[PDB]
Write an enzyme that holds these catalytic residues in place. Structure first.
Site, PDB file in Angstrom:
ATOM      1  CG  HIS A  41      -0.516   0.125   2.498  1.00 47.87           C
ATOM      2  ND1 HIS A  41      -0.094   1.407   3.002  1.00 47.87           N
ATOM      3  CD2 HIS A  41      -0.388  -0.659   3.228  1.00 47.87           C
ATOM      4  CE1 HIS A  41       0.239   1.382   4.131  1.00 47.87           C
ATOM      5  NE2 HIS A  41      -0.111  -0.200   4.778  1.00 47.87           N
ATOM      6  N   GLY A 136       2.305   5.803  10.569  1.00 46.34           N
ATOM      7  CA  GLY A 136       3.737   5.820  10.146  1.00 46.34           C
ATOM      8  C   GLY A 136       4.261   4.401  10.757  1.00 46.34           C
ATOM      9  CB  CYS A 138       2.256   1.081   7.482  1.00 47.06           C
ATOM     10  SG  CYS A 138       0.808   1.298   7.931  1.00 47.06           S
TER      11      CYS A 138
END
Ligand SMILES: CN(c1ccc2cncc(NC(=O)Cc3cccc(Cl)c3)c2c1)S(C)(=O)=O
Ligand SMILES: CN(c1ccc2cncc(NC(=O)Cc3cccc(Cl)c3)c2c1)S(C)(=O)=O
Ligand SMILES: [Cl-]
Lengths: 298, 305
Positions: A41, A136, A138
């Site tokens: 993503h 942040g 991820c």
């Protein structure tokens, strides 16, 4: 003495964390050998259509204060693999492993490729993790250590509306019926990890907490009939076998410990605590209890 | 979202752990630059422990009596000195993995990460707090002596604790990195007991602010209190007195949530009176006191849910 929620030493994983930027999105990547793994993503959906439009120089990879050169890119399930020119000299001995619900692992939470914290958690039976993650995070990873081998088992992808977290194994396959997109997704009804609660009751006995023990025993079938009524996962004969060593060390048979758990479920703690907790703790596996009450090093 | 007991990443500390052996005793040491720091009780036998004269025991030692092992490499001890209850072993190699560090002495209520080690090998990391009675509720087995407590604020490791002993109640006692014990403890096998422990009030309040930031308000009430009336109630539940310093420290969290410190003190008074009534706060059925106001600000978002 003492019983803490203990994570594996994070040093071998810290040496692999990098920052990945694509456009306006910034998240974390795992740099192993000459490949950086991160949530797909980061390019955001039709991920193949979005990926074909990106060139190598669109992905900015930063390892500390050093910029890495992306020389290739490919997608494997929900994970993006960025081929870099430099192999990570700090690459530890590692494996990619998929875990089952009830198993525990350490999470190295990162922001901008910089590790900020380490915590221990369990894969819930509903495939979510009760983590502590902000925007942040991820790309932050979950792992276990076996001797000197790091087994990577989780990569963080998203937060669900209830504040719980969803992610994939390192091959990009999600844990749970989740998808990497902004859509109506909800965690299923969660259950308690029974084998883990039993292991934690054995850890309490080892630490001198025996108030909940009783003279009674139960059949596995009668225990499962009661446990199913309190949203507890069924205890299988495999779980009973896995609790064998703790049962032999304390002198309390697994079905004898199940009768203690039945009384705790039907009558509560009654103002008492077990290992400083007023709730029955299910995020320590039988192996975690043996490891913490033995002193295994890495 | 979410609130976990979070430890600092331990990598910078792992690269400093070594094994120190003197005679039959083996424990952990902290190798920083060309010095290895470890508990001075490494020079003792089990017989010496009742009333050891460390000066007398140390003068009988030579450099080659101390075996220091860093991984599978033997380090050469070229000097030794005692500073309070820590032994400092000068070695012939500076640790190339030495991080940026400071030695800091902490106060009760302060939290830190512990890297538990056995035979110079790290086995686990956990987060804990210095109790008001100066003990720590750790998880330590025999061989863990020399394991250290630290904070990593920014890129600098602040070492604050070195493990020395377990008290009869299963709690732990240790020193700062200058060898000064926290609490009225001595590195002797004499009858020593931890004082009556109390709850870290400023930390419970910080954790109630973290619950509000994460969207939970069930415990709030329309009441406020004076600091004196709160302390009169709090001391009846074995809670540490809340000072004006604590009220000042909670200022940022009070401004972020819109709940005045003395109003949060009123919710705490009510929770102590009523219990939780089957409810939880941040997944806990007890009031948690091992998160400082600084830990809550560091872990939680700047936008209240
Ligand atoms: C930006 N915020 C947060 C807060 C905590 C978060 C914790 N973990 C991950 C986040 N990221 C996503 O879930 C991004 C996403 C969205 C849809 C599909 C996927 Cl696969 C991924 C988190 C985002 S907030 C305050 O809720 O607006
Ligand atoms: C009771 N035992 C343990 C268990 C956990 C322990 C945890 N930490 C430290 C220990 N070491 C001492 O306390 C050694 C000592 C004794 C007196 C004064 C000092 Cl400064 C140091 C521990 C010893 S055992 C199973 O018999 O080995
Ligand atoms: Cl402090």
């Amino acid at each position: 003495s003492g019983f803490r929620k203990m994570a594996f030493p994070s040093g071998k994983v810290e040496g692999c964390m990098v920052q990945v930027t694509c456009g306006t999105t910034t998240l974390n990547g795992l740099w192993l050998d000459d490949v950086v793994y991160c949530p797909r993503h980061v390019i955001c959906p039709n991920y193949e259509d979005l990926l074909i439009r990106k060139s190598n120089h669109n992905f900015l990879v930063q390892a500390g204060n050093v910029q890495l050169r992306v020389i290739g890119h490919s997608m494997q399930n929900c994970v993006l693999k960025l081929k870099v020119d430099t192999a990570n000299p700090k690459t530890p001995k590692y494996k990619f492993v998929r875990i089952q619900p009830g198993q525990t692992f350490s999470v190295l939470a990162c922001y901008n490729g910089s590790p900020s914290g380490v915590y221990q958690c369990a894969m819930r039976p509903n495939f979510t993790i009760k983590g502590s993650f902000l925007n942040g995070s991820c790309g932050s990873v979950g792992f276990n250590i076996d001797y000197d081998c790091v087994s990577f088992c989780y990569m963080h992808h998203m937060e669900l509306p209830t504040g719980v977290h969803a992610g994939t194994d390192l091959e990009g396959n999600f844990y749970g019926p989740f998808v990497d997109r902004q859509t109506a997704q909800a965690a299923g009804t969660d259950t308690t990890i029974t084998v883990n609660v039993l292991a934690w009751l054995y850890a309490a006995v080892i630490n001198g907490d025996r108030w909940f023990l009783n003279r009674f025993t139960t059949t596995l079938n009668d225990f499962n009939l009661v446990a199913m009524k309190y949203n507890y996962e069924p205890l299988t004969q495999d779980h009973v076998d896995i609790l064998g060593p703790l049962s032999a060390q304390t002198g309390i048979a697994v079905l004898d410990m199940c009768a203690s758990l039945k009384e705790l479920l039907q009558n509560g703690m009654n103002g008492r605590t077990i290992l400083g907790s007023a709730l029955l703790e299910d995020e320590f596996t039988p192996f975690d209890v043996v490891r913490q009450c033995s002193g295994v090093t890495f």
